[PDB]
From a paper:
To investigate if the interchange of Val to His in FNR1 and His to Val in [name] could explain the differences in the efficiencies of Fld or IsdG reduction, we generated cross-mutants of the two proteins, FNR1V329H and FNR2H326V. In the case of FNR2H326V, the replacement of His with Val resulted in a nearly 3-fold decrease in the turnover number in the reduction of NrdI and a 15-fold decrease in the reduction rate of Fld1, as compared to our previous studies on the wild-type protein. In contrast, the FNR2H326V crystal structure revealed interesting and unusual features, including an asymmetric rotation of the NAD(P)H-binding domain relative to the FAD-binding domain in the two monomers of the biological dimer. Interestingly, the second monomer has adopted a different conformation of the NAD(P)H-binding domain, resulting in an asymmetric dimer. This conformation is more closed, resembling the low-molecular-weight (low Mr) TrxR structure, where a different conformational change is required for catalysis than for FNRs. Furthermore, the second monomer with the alternative conformation completely lacks electron density corresponding to the FAD cofactor and is, in fact, an apoprotein. In the conformation seen for the FAD-free monomer, the position conventionally occupied by FAD is not stacked by the C-terminal subdomain of the opposite monomer. Moreover, the total loss of the FAD cofactor in one monomer, and a 100% occupancy in the other has never been described previously. Additionally, the asymmetry in FNR2H326V indicates that the enzyme may exhibit a negative cooperativity with respect to the binding of FAD, possibly affecting the reaction rate of Fld reduction.
Numbering used by the authors:
A (entry chain A): 6 to 319
B (entry chain B): 6 to 331
Write the structure that this text describes.
């Protein structure tokens, strides 16, 4: 958007959602940039169902059940949420405005608050050749709509819970749905795996894919047995990968921020070495910093107010 | 008894309750000392029924329900709860152990975390030493039951956070709820004033009352602007004063702690100037500190871990992930 905002939040993590809540709380046009197509950061991506106990007020809380509590607390102000954008450049222009260039567009902000935790959460890719031409066409890593694969032969890679449920959702939808894993025992919930055999889903296991046959759309996938090392091809139309999520800093170190051991040096005002750029959550660090969500929750409003004193004279 | 505890927490308020939980999170014998006869601190005593919205994770949670969610969260470690004790002396003896003397007995701790308010029980009123009879009847300072002001016309005097929210929570119950302040800007969070204007709650600008029409109960309040001197009478059933300019620290001032603005000055490690003494919540202060519950909850584990690293060297600062302790 060409409209410069007031606070642009790098990271849709738990610190980023609650900080987005506090932005409107001080009359701030709030913009969130997230590398994922989903909010939640580490919780929604790495452990959404697990119970967390050291969050203030929650003797027992699910990770994602708290995320919805943060999104609902946040939708009270409706910030401009720009998903599927990984911030690449963060540069201060001649007038103090920050120029943020992502993979989509360039966003502008009077101040930028970086709640990025450990890095950007782009999914785990493959380990083949330049599949970018498959990725732009029929090679997917996220499931937006499941019905787009109805009547098409679809292959699924992975063994986790995330992979098995996606396959079980394609049994009455996908023409031919096959799930591939490297071991005979799916690293998933046991009673959901039992339903996978009690369905029309072909279960190829233990297999690992090798060759992605397709001129530009993947139409055949060459497998290979873990023990006998025989190659088995199955004709496909779309390919779905669910191995898990990965994070990494990348361009974060090259933004002129004092970074030592993948953490931004911030003061008690949550101010980095760049005026107008603030950080909170686990991505920040200082004397006695404890990498917690409870601490990241207390670093968020401190970061909004000290930025409010940066871009708005009271 | 003569147990040299590990962490003795001054204050059974909301910040101290979460701090007591996180003490057990690092395997610390926890002692809580509270001047009130009840835990909850400011919440259980001054507004136990009101709804809180700026708590991380709770878009809308009741105050006492938040206290009970903390007490339920805390009883996982069963800290030593000493009620009705106001710490008078806090001295570090020759071996580093702190000696705490309350009105009752002498307690011991390896380290001390100060989460208490002031030890007292007083918001802040105006300057009339008469009218003493309205307070026993309809001039209130505290929200006990929300229904006692329901169906009654309630007028509120003040501009702080307490004045704007009480007016906003009396809007769907009280016939006429009015907020009166001595200044042109309600010094509150911006969206609580935004919700204050967008309702039937009558919003009185800077006014100062004159005539409390009543032999013992105020039934009409004749107003007066601080500068323009306009007379506005408002029919009321209850009269509410919500200034709340904090209050003096008291026995905290005599402990050798660097104090700025009735608040203990702490570093980013939540350390006071005394090694082994920590402070968090609204009682602590530093650069850009915001007197919030969101901040005070985030300052609490900062102090527990830095204290676990104070009295126990071979313990990692970064703790064990919470899921791996259940
Ligand atoms: C398995 C596990 C268990 C845990 N258990 C606990 C526990 O019990 N208690 C506890 O207190 N803490 C726990 N934690 C820690 C907790 O998850 C973190 O402290 C918390 O997530 C910090 O919030 P954050 O937003 O800074 O991190 P994150 O959730 O990592 O936020 C990072 C977000 O920013 C985005 N992002 C990053 N870089 C970019 C970029 N360049 N462009 C665009 N978007 C970007 C990412 O996509 C992501 O959404 C646990 C962590 C893990 C991994």
């Amino acid at each position: 958007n060409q409209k410069v905002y007031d606070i642009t939040i790098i990271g849709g993590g738990p610190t980023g959602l609650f900080t987005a809540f506090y932005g409107g709380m001080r009359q701030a046009s709030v913009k969130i940039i997230e590398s994922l197509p989903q909010l939640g950061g580490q919780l929604s991506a790495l452990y959404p169902e697990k119970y967390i106990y050291d969050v203030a007020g929650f003797p027992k809380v699910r990770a994602q059940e708290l995320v919805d509590n943060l999104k609902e607390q946040m939708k009270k102000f409706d910030p401009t949420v720009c998903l599927e954008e990984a911030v690449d450049t963060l540069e201060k222009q001649a007038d103090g405005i920050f120029k943020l260039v992502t993979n989509k567009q360039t966003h502008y902000s009077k101040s930028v608050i970086i709640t990025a935790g450990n890095g950007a959460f782009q999914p785990r890719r493959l380990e083949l050749e330049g599949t970018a031409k498959y990725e732009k066409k029929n090679l997917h890593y996220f499931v937006d709509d499941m019905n787009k694969f109805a009547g098409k032969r679809v292959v699924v890679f992975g063994g986790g819970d995330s992979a098995v449920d996606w396959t079980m959702m394609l049994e009455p939808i996908a023409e031919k749905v096959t799930i591939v894993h490297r071991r005979d025992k799916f690293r998933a919930h046991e009673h959901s795996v039992e339903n996978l055999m009690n369905s029309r889903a072909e279960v190829s296991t233990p297999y690992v894919p090798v060759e992605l046959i397709g001129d530009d759309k993947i139409e055949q996938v060459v497998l290979q047995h873990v023990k006998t090392e025989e190659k088995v091809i199955i004709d496909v139309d779309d390919v779905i990968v669910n191995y898990g999520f990965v994070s990494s800093l990348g361009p974060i170190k090259n933004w002129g921020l004092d970074i030592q051991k993948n953490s931004i040096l911030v003061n008690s005002k949550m101010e980095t070495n760049i005026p107008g750029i603030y950080a909170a959550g686990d991505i920040c660090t200082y004397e006695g910093k404890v990498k917690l969500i409870a601490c990241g929750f207390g670093e968020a409003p401190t970061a909004v107010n000290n930025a409010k004193a940066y871009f708005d004279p009271n």
